[PDB]
């Protein structure tokens, strides 16, 4: 069974916005890692730069292109050096619609994405799969609507398991309250993308997690995070329960 | 000796320097145990009130959410704790550079403040002030700080004729606040230091820091 | 041997628009980076890096207030001596200068100074004495060295292909020699303590407090240079 989903290149107004909330100043923020160490600062991408490029070149300017070639890292090994060599033209993260995200592998080597969307699209379990994107391939890795639906659902699901454990253990004088933020470290996960350049991880590979690959990045989508937060704030408040 | 001060909720001059107002009145740095997580959050002077909660909106400005942040080194222990940060708290800046904390979290907040140290009559830095939910305590008085950094630098300087000689790295601490969410530290707790707690934040007060710079250029250490 | 060098007090290359910042400075304590990367606006041609505490940012980086849970007594002793630190000035399109204001000299790592001193690239330490005001980076010289270096990289690679089963295609890496190149655009200086043979600190990252300075304009020029390299085309 393919834990590794392959993604080869495939050459070619009626519905309101998801939220009235105004767009963010940045549509996403990107943190680059070498193994379990973050190299360089977090790169923010203005919502006015619908396409950001992350290659292995050296221009520091910022804005819509985030270079990794010039970054230093005192702990860097000879392996990370080998890998960093092949990043090259890297990838393009394109933001369409309110907050949909696409990836364009411009590198000569395949990139390995970690996306909850792609997981669902492959009939796989959440987080159980590595999506390999072949050089030149151009595929959608995140759908705002799909994510939003999932959030409200998961959020509800949790809120219930809240009153569940609540009525569970629940004599003297004692009060109960839902953990101010149940299932949050999980809903946020739905708003974060990740991708490893050159090297892939998982069963078929020596790297077991992405934290074990020479050079990857973690993409935080803000418009998704805006929604989610807005969702968390539409839940019954933790009112002490005798 | 009552190392832990208790702050339950109890319902209710001109500028010190001509020096210009800070771009940001403070900057917060969130840590998990002894690792800094996220970027350092900087609060504009036009945002006299900042909220640090456990939610997930990444926007800048007056709200710093620790919920969406990641940490490869994160542990179950830390996660379980982050679970209760909730409404978090509100750090407020009054006057030229005074600071007040307002706990909104359902659970206590343990602040490390020199100002409170004096009020509680404890030896400087030998106390952990526990802010109870809904409490609206004042944690930093600019004027006092100013009075203190001067004297402390004056004595640290005069102590050159010789320990008593403090360097920048001791005076700067007068301009910094620190607080832990949910968990507390001290002798009555497993965590002996703040950097040994699941989630806390170090707060740098910029107005106070300026005064200190202005002071290290008159009473050189 | 002369690994340690002593420096006591004694037209546009591109149309590409001037960088937003002319350099990015990162502060380190041993092998740890304390504080955030300070970015200097091009409008602040001279930035000051001292050991004081104004957080104001802009044209002055203070390492005084910065915190580090890993800090030690040795690093604390060392920070004590940074004082007025240094001044990094930017002349022209991208030339960098250093003026030691500290009472203690500092030790820069400058590929340009290496060229001048007639020493193997990167194999030297330049000690800037208090009061000294010496040039440490030259764009023109840097630009010229880049191209010839990138070019040598290329040749070497293609010469690696010939050095090699017919039914298979071979190909050269995209980032060939890209590291050593970008290094030509970065400066490093250690306050108070030097490093090298004559020192108990064998490398910059073994010193209590140093900074790495990324020269922006130079980095752009190298980007263009890199984008003028023959696209990698797998030959069978």
From Swiss-Prot, chain B:
Entry GO terms, CC: activin responsive factor complex; centrosome; chromatin; ciliary basal body; cytoplasm; cytosol; heteromeric SMAD protein complex; nucleoplasm
UniProt crosslink position (Glycyl lysine isopeptide (Lys-Gly) (interchain with G-Cter in ubiquitin)): 195
Site (Necessary for heterotrimerization): 191
Effect of residue 63 to H: In a colorectal cancer sample; somatic mutation
A GO term for molecular function: DNA-binding transcription activator activity, RNA polymerase II-specific
Top-level taxon of origin: Eukaryota
Protein name according to UniProt: Mothers against decapentaplegic homolog 4
Variant or mutagenesis effect after changing residue 53 to N: In a colorectal cancer sample; somatic mutation
Included stretch of the parent chain: 285 to 545 of 552
UniProtKB/Swiss-Prot annotation, chain C:
Stated consequence of mutating residue 182 to S: No effect on heterotrimerization. Partially diminished transcriptional activation
Domain of life where this protein originates: Eukaryota
Result for mutant: residue 115 to S: No effect on heterotrimerization. Partially diminished transcriptional activation
Outcome, altering residue 179 to H: In pancreatic carcinoma
Domain MH2, first and last residues per copy: 22-236
Modified positions (N6-acetyllysine) in chain numbering: 127, 193
Glycyl lysine isopeptide (Lys-Gly) (interchain with G-Cter in ubiquitin) cross-link site: 205
UniProt feature coiled coil, ranges: none
Annotated positions for site Necessary for heterotrimerization: 201
Subcellular location, record wording: Cytoplasm; Nucleus
TM stretches of this protein: none
PTM entry text: Phosphorylated by PDPK1. Monoubiquitinated on Lys-205 by E3 ubiquitin-protein ligase TRIM33. Monoubiquitination hampers its ability to form a stable complex with activated SMAD2/3 resulting in inhibition of TGF-beta/BMP signaling cascade. Deubiquitination by USP9X restores its competence to mediate TGF-beta signaling.
Subunit organization: Monomer; in the absence of TGF-beta activation. Heterotrimer; on TGF-beta activation. Heterotrimer composed of two molecules of a C-terminally phosphorylated R-SMAD molecule, SMAD2 or SMAD3, and one molecule of SMAD4 to form the transcriptional active SMAD2/SMAD3-SMAD4 complex. Found in a ternary complex composed of SMAD4, STK11/LKB1 and STK11IP. Found in a complex with SMAD1 and YY1. Identified in a complex that contains at least ZNF451, SMAD2, SMAD3 and SMAD4. Interacts with ATF2, COPS5, DACH1, MSG1, SKI, STK11/LKB1, STK11IP and TRIM33.
Record-stated family: Belongs to the dwarfin/SMAD family.
Domain notes: The MH1 domain is required for DNA binding. The MH2 domain is required for both homomeric and heteromeric interactions and for transcriptional regulation. Sufficient for nuclear import.
Disorder association: Pancreatic cancer: A malignant neoplasm of the pancreas. Tumors can arise from both the exocrine and endocrine portions of the pancreas, but 95% of them develop from the exocrine portion, including the ductal epithelium, acinar cells, connective tissue, and lymphatic tissue. Juvenile polyposis syndrome: Autosomal dominant gastrointestinal hamartomatous polyposis syndrome in which patients are at risk for developing gastrointestinal cancers. The lesions are typified by a smooth histological appearance, predominant stroma, cystic spaces and lack of a smooth muscle core. Multiple juvenile polyps usually occur in a number of Mendelian disorders. Sometimes, these polyps occur without associated features as in JPS; here, polyps tend to occur in the large bowel and are associated with an increased risk of colon and other gastrointestinal cancers.
Protein name (Swiss-Prot/TrEMBL): Mothers against decapentaplegic homolog 4
Parent-protein residues present: 285 to 550 of 552
